[PDB]
Write a protein that binds this ligand. Structure first.
Ligand SMILES: *CCC(=O)Nc1cccc(CNc2c(C(N)=O)cnn3cccc23)c1
Length: 265
């Protein structure tokens, strides 16, 4: 991908821009999403490329290549954008079976990420993209880490909204496949609230809630959790409660959650 053939359109999300790969220079070329650095950050970015280039799933945003000119990461562009805003815009159209379809695909994608020893560390509805009405894909691999063969966890202070963090990430910066399962429980809650602002993880935790991180942690240690979303099927709420188990070892695996989500449809 020659840099001189990548034409800027707008900003999407370091930053992600909407560009057109226009070799003919006639405004007929394909639309792409291009990520760039705006030191140690160069090492973080090279890592993101290698991780994403080695991922191959219908439920993970597709790597296209890298750019060359006088380096940028080139990926596929999904016009529908993030799942958070799509859920808010199409509230009346999506029913509990469509929400369970989205839930199942995310889970299948996470199953594949853990098979590749990859911890995402930023799983949330805002970071999932919509391919079509019936197809969702996991994105934003900016905080992704690879677990060594000898280790099952990773020790990192986080700069993401604190409401998606497992207690062991809050109290000790421990990140694992099991902290991704905690976050996933928050993704289900977000899905069944249709990413409504007034009952969002931030809104509802701040109402229930020394520093803020410590207050949230005290609350979670007490066994307090987010309430069942309005009109939530009980079976779904029981699954969120399983993902929010205090001990990482007691949380269901993505391969265990998969058939349970499919059975509900
Ligand atoms: C909900 C707000 C939002 O746009 N969030 C968001 C989440 C993850 C990633 C991005 C930017 N990236 C992006 C890609 C890509 N390949 O990373 C592809 N297609 N689109 C459409 C809109 C944004 C993106 C933003």
């Amino acid at each position: 991908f020659e840099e001189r053939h990548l034409k800027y359109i707008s900003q999407l999300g370091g930053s992600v821009e909407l560009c057109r790969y226009d070799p003919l220079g006639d405004n007929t070329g394909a639309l792409v999403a291009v990520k760039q650095l705006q030191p140690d950050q160069q090492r973080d970015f090279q890592r993101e490329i290698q991780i994403l280039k080695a991922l191959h799933s219908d439920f993970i945003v597709k790597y296209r290549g890298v750019s060359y000119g006088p380096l940028r990461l080139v990926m596929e562009y999904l016009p529908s954008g993030c799942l958070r805003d799509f859920l808010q815009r199409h509230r009346a159209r999506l029913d509990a079976s469509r929400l369970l379809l989205y839930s199942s695909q995310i889970c299948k994608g996470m199953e594949y990420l853990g098979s590749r020893r990859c911890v995402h560390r930023d799983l949330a509805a805002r970071n999932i993209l919509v391919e079509s009405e019936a197809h969702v894909k996991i994105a934003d691999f900016g905080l992704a880490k690879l677990l060594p063969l000898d280790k099952d966890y990773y020790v990192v202070p986080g700069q993401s909204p604190i409401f998606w963090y497992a207690p062991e990430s809050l109290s000790d910066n421990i990140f694992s496949r099991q902290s991704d399962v905690w976050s996933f429980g928050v993704v289900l809650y977000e899905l069944f609230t249709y990413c409504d602002k007034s009952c969002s993880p931030s809104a509802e935790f701040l109402r229930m809630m020394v520093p803020a991180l410590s207050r949230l942690l005290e609350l979670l240690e007490e066994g307090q959790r987010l309430p069942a979303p309005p009109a939530c099927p009980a079976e779904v709420h029981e699954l969120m409660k399983l993902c929010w188990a205090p001990s990482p070892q007691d949380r269901p695996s993505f391969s265990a959650l998969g058939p349970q989500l499919d059975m509900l449809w």
